[PDB]
Design an enzyme around this catalytic site. Structure first.
Site, PDB file in Angstrom:
ATOM      1  N   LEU A 101      34.543  35.948  35.608  1.00  0.00           N
ATOM      2  CA  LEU A 101      34.907  36.892  34.554  1.00  0.00           C
ATOM      3  C   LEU A 101      35.932  36.605  33.454  1.00  0.00           C
ATOM      4  O   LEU A 101      35.844  37.218  32.429  1.00  0.00           O
ATOM      5  CB  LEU A 101      35.024  38.356  35.029  1.00  0.00           C
ATOM      6  CG  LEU A 101      33.948  39.074  35.851  1.00  0.00           C
ATOM      7  CD1 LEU A 101      34.457  40.314  36.524  1.00  0.00           C
ATOM      8  CD2 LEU A 101      32.678  39.359  35.158  1.00  0.00           C
ATOM      9  N   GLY A 102      36.908  35.729  33.606  1.00  0.00           N
ATOM     10  CA  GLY A 102      37.266  34.989  34.820  1.00  0.00           C
ATOM     11  C   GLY A 102      38.668  34.401  34.659  1.00  0.00           C
ATOM     12  O   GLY A 102      39.564  35.078  34.133  1.00  0.00           O
ATOM     13  N   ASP A 151      53.848  44.222  32.218  1.00  0.00           N
ATOM     14  CA  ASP A 151      52.896  43.497  31.349  1.00  0.00           C
ATOM     15  C   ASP A 151      51.795  44.404  30.810  1.00  0.00           C
ATOM     16  O   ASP A 151      50.604  44.073  30.864  1.00  0.00           O
ATOM     17  CB  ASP A 151      52.280  42.310  32.069  1.00  0.00           C
ATOM     18  CG  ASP A 151      51.715  41.260  31.105  1.00  0.00           C
ATOM     19  OD1 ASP A 151      52.128  41.226  29.924  1.00  0.00           O
ATOM     20  OD2 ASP A 151      50.851  40.462  31.536  1.00  0.00           O
ATOM     21  N   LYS A 190      39.569  39.209  42.794  1.00  0.00           N
ATOM     22  CA  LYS A 190      40.524  38.266  42.200  1.00  0.00           C
ATOM     23  C   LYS A 190      40.821  37.175  43.215  1.00  0.00           C
ATOM     24  O   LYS A 190      41.291  37.471  44.322  1.00  0.00           O
ATOM     25  CB  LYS A 190      41.820  38.982  41.782  1.00  0.00           C
ATOM     26  CG  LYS A 190      42.834  38.124  41.042  1.00  0.00           C
ATOM     27  CD  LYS A 190      43.835  38.960  40.249  1.00  0.00           C
ATOM     28  CE  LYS A 190      45.007  38.084  39.790  1.00  0.00           C
ATOM     29  NZ  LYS A 190      45.661  38.490  38.495  1.00  0.00           N
ATOM     30  N   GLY A 192      42.141  32.696  33.620  1.00  0.00           N
ATOM     31  CA  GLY A 192      43.016  33.011  34.762  1.00  0.00           C
ATOM     32  C   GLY A 192      44.127  31.997  35.069  1.00  0.00           C
ATOM     33  O   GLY A 192      43.856  30.922  35.627  1.00  0.00           O
ATOM     34  N   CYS A 193      45.373  32.346  34.721  1.00  0.00           N
ATOM     35  CA  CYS A 193      46.558  31.494  34.984  1.00  0.00           C
ATOM     36  C   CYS A 193      46.839  31.226  36.469  1.00  0.00           C
ATOM     37  O   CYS A 193      46.944  30.062  36.895  1.00  0.00           O
ATOM     38  CB  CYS A 193      47.819  32.089  34.340  1.00  0.00           C
ATOM     39  SG  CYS A 193      48.507  31.127  32.964  1.00  0.00           S
ATOM     40  N   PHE A 194      46.983  32.308  37.240  1.00  0.00           N
ATOM     41  CA  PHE A 194      47.202  32.225  38.689  1.00  0.00           C
ATOM     42  C   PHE A 194      45.875  32.137  39.464  1.00  0.00           C
ATOM     43  O   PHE A 194      45.834  31.619  40.579  1.00  0.00           O
ATOM     44  CB  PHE A 194      48.047  33.411  39.168  1.00  0.00           C
ATOM     45  N   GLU A 216      41.149  33.121  39.284  1.00  0.00           N
ATOM     46  CA  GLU A 216      39.922  33.697  38.729  1.00  0.00           C
ATOM     47  C   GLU A 216      39.765  35.195  38.965  1.00  0.00           C
ATOM     48  O   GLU A 216      40.551  35.808  39.681  1.00  0.00           O
ATOM     49  CB  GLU A 216      38.707  33.014  39.355  1.00  0.00           C
ATOM     50  CG  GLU A 216      38.546  31.549  39.043  1.00  0.00           C
ATOM     51  CD  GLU A 216      37.703  30.867  40.083  1.00  0.00           C
ATOM     52  OE1 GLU A 216      38.226  30.603  41.186  1.00  0.00           O
ATOM     53  OE2 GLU A 216      36.517  30.605  39.808  1.00  0.00           O
ATOM     54  N   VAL A 217      38.730  35.761  38.346  1.00  0.00           N
ATOM     55  CA  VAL A 217      38.257  37.112  38.616  1.00  0.00           C
ATOM     56  C   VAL A 217      36.728  37.038  38.644  1.00  0.00           C
ATOM     57  O   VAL A 217      36.111  36.556  37.699  1.00  0.00           O
ATOM     58  CB  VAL A 217      38.695  38.150  37.529  1.00  0.00           C
ATOM     59  CG1 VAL A 217      38.273  39.561  37.942  1.00  0.00           C
ATOM     60  CG2 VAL A 217      40.200  38.114  37.262  1.00  0.00           C
TER      61      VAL A 217
HETATM   62  C1  LIG Z   1      38.627  40.290  30.033  1.00  0.00           C
HETATM   63  C2  LIG Z   1      39.081  39.999  31.464  1.00  0.00           C
HETATM   64  C3  LIG Z   1      38.671  40.790  32.706  1.00  0.00           C
HETATM   65  O1  LIG Z   1      39.560  41.031  33.497  1.00  0.00           O
HETATM   66  N1  LIG Z   1      37.419  41.048  33.025  1.00  0.00           N
HETATM   67  C4  LIG Z   1      37.275  41.877  34.060  1.00  0.00           C
HETATM   68  C5  LIG Z   1      36.159  42.679  34.055  1.00  0.00           C
HETATM   69  C6  LIG Z   1      35.961  43.597  35.045  1.00  0.00           C
HETATM   70  C7  LIG Z   1      36.894  43.767  36.040  1.00  0.00           C
HETATM   71  N2  LIG Z   1      36.666  44.690  36.967  1.00  0.00           N
HETATM   72  C8  LIG Z   1      37.526  44.892  37.928  1.00  0.00           C
HETATM   73  N3  LIG Z   1      38.632  44.205  38.034  1.00  0.00           N
HETATM   74  C9  LIG Z   1      38.971  43.250  37.157  1.00  0.00           C
HETATM   75  N4  LIG Z   1      40.152  42.628  37.365  1.00  0.00           N
HETATM   76  C10 LIG Z   1      40.911  42.637  38.506  1.00  0.00           C
HETATM   77  C11 LIG Z   1      40.411  42.167  39.716  1.00  0.00           C
HETATM   78  C12 LIG Z   1      41.146  42.144  40.900  1.00  0.00           C
HETATM   79  C13 LIG Z   1      42.455  42.596  40.838  1.00  0.00           C
HETATM   80  C14 LIG Z   1      43.043  43.077  39.666  1.00  0.00           C
HETATM   81 BR1  LIG Z   1      44.864  43.703  39.712  1.00  0.00          BR
HETATM   82  C15 LIG Z   1      42.240  43.087  38.512  1.00  0.00           C
HETATM   83  C16 LIG Z   1      38.063  43.003  36.084  1.00  0.00           C
HETATM   84  C17 LIG Z   1      38.234  42.074  35.060  1.00  0.00           C
HETATM   85  C18 LIG Z   1      38.930  38.944  29.383  1.00  0.00           C
HETATM   86  N5  LIG Z   1      40.079  38.999  28.479  1.00  0.00           N
HETATM   87  C19 LIG Z   1      40.451  37.706  27.946  1.00  0.00           C
HETATM   88  C20 LIG Z   1      41.279  39.627  28.986  1.00  0.00           C
END
Ligand SMILES: */C(=C\C(=O)Nc1ccc2ncnc(Nc3cccc(Br)c3)c2c1)CN(C)C
Length: 245
Positions: A18-19, A117, A40, A21-23, A25-26
């Site tokens: 998704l993805g 943040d 994550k 990611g510094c620390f 992926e997602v």
């Molecule tokens: C957009 C980045 C992005 O984070 N895409 C993204 C789409 C859908 C989504 N659904 C659920 N959760 C996350 N992130 C997540 C996962 C696990 C823990 C946490 Br806290 C957050 C998610 C993320 C790209 N752009 C450059 C920012």
């Protein structure tokens, strides 16, 4: 020794990135065969905070550590604002998005937590333009926090002021043409971003309240929530659509 949030990683079927990611992926994925989730890869906080407008923890794992959450089908807000779908967003949609983030943060505030943040990259969008605070470089950071590490809910309020300029400019980088040093020097000298094109004065005043030098003079999220929910009746009842807002 685990808790009841814990799962076997065998219960997780990862699919799409998704993805990163510094620390880390997602990923998009499936959990227990039935349930679409986000995972994550490389939470204690996320266990204790439970709100409608905050991303919802489902499960956690342990190396490799997974954090499993409710899936947000429309992605991050930065990208949504920048992308195809809005060129057509207008002030009422963007103020309602603001209301919802404010609602999640009024909750953070009630619980005596700090985000640290808060910005459009860390808001997630789902069906029906629902927005949730996720994921608990200084253009978003209150001066006292970028300099002296003084992170409080009032530094989050500042950040929310900047997120409001991201909303009104469809996700443009704050302080355009200014490097982080010039932002930091200028903000100390009392410079604030000006009223964005078409943005009502009452909304820019609100931004300015969030950017008060003195953290304790910045409004609460509770006030923010209430002002933004009621905006088009109490504050701007004679609002008309324009070219962009
Ligand atoms: C957009 C980045 C992005 O984070 N895409 C993204 C789409 C859908 C989504 N659904 C659920 N959760 C996350 N992130 C997540 C996962 C696990 C823990 C946490 Br806290 C957050 C998610 C993320 C790209 N752009 C450059 C920012």
């Amino acid at each position: 020794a685990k808790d009841a949030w814990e799962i076997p990683r065998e219960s997780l079927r990862l699919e799409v990135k998704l993805g990163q990611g510094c620390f880390g992926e997602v990923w998009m994925g499936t959990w227990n065969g039935t349930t679409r989730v986000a995972i994550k890869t490389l939470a204690q906080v996320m266990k204790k905070l439970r709100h409608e407008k905050l991303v919802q923890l489902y499960a956690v794992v342990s190396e490799p550590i997974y954090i499993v959450t409710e899936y947000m089908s429309k992605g991050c807000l930065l990208d949504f604002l920048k992308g195809e779908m809005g060129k057509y967003l207008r002030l009422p949609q963007l103020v309602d998005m603001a209301a919802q983030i404010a609602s999640g943060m009024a909750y953070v505030e009630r619980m005596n937590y700090v985000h640290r943040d808060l910005r459009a990259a860390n808001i997630l969008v789902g069906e029906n333009l629902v927005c949730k605070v996720a994921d608990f470089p200084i253009k978003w950071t209150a001066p006292e926090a970028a300099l002296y590490g003084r992170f409080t809910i009032k530094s989050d309020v500042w950040s929310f002021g900047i997120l409001l300029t991201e909303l009104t400019t469809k996700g443009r980088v704050p302080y355009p043409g200014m490097v982080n040093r010039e932002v930091l020097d200028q903000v100390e000298r009392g410079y604030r971003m000006p009223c964005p094109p078409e943005c009502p004065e009452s909304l820019h005043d609100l931004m300015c309240q969030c950017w008060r030098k003195d953290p304790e003079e910045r409004p609460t999220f509770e006030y923010l929530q209430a002002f933004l929910e009621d905006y088009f009746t109490s504050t701007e009842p004679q609002y008309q659509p324009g070219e962009n807002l």
